Amino acid sequence: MGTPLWALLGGPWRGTATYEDGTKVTLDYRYTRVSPDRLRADVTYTTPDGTTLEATVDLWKDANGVIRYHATYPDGTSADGTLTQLDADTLLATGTYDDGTKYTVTLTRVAP
Ligand SMILES: [K+]
């Protein structure tokens, strides 16, 4: 079965993304739609160098049990990715932007 989709709903709705070089970015999010098979959230994060970015993210779990997401940004850009549970606290997120650029970050929910 793996990680239940609604596991993503718990705890404080804030986390940190850690990049390959150790850089960390804060993620603040708010769920706007919840159904047994699909979540949607508005996400805000401030990158290094101070740009503030907003995205709308749809999440679901495919029949192989993989948690997938599709993020859309105000400018029309999109990203498609997967979330893989590492331990109880952390997810591995790997995405591809519509320009072909890829990323890999870990996501950890801030402690309550
Ligand atoms: K944008």
Report how far residue 62's alpha carbon sits from residue 100's, in angstroms, rounded to the nearest whole number: 22
Residue 42 is part of a domain; what is its CATH number? 2.40.128.120
Instruction: Kindly give the distance from the C-alpha atom of residue 73 to the centroid of ligand 1, in angstroms, as a whole number.
Output: 5
56 is written with which tokens? 């709308």
d(CA 12, CA 110): 7
Domain that holds residue 73: 5-109
Ligand 1 center–CA 102 separation, angstroms: 17
Resolution in A: 1.9
Q: How many domains, the chain? A: 1
* Six token digits for residue 110: 């801030």
Would you tell me how many other CB atoms lie within 10 Å of the CB of residue 75? 7
Q: Would you call 8 exposed, middle or buried from its count of C-beta atoms within 10 A (0-12, 13-18, 19+)?
A: buried
Sign of the torsion angle spanned by Cα atoms 38, 19, 24, 101: negative
CA of 89 to the centre of ligand 1 (A): 29
Structure-determination technique:
X-ray
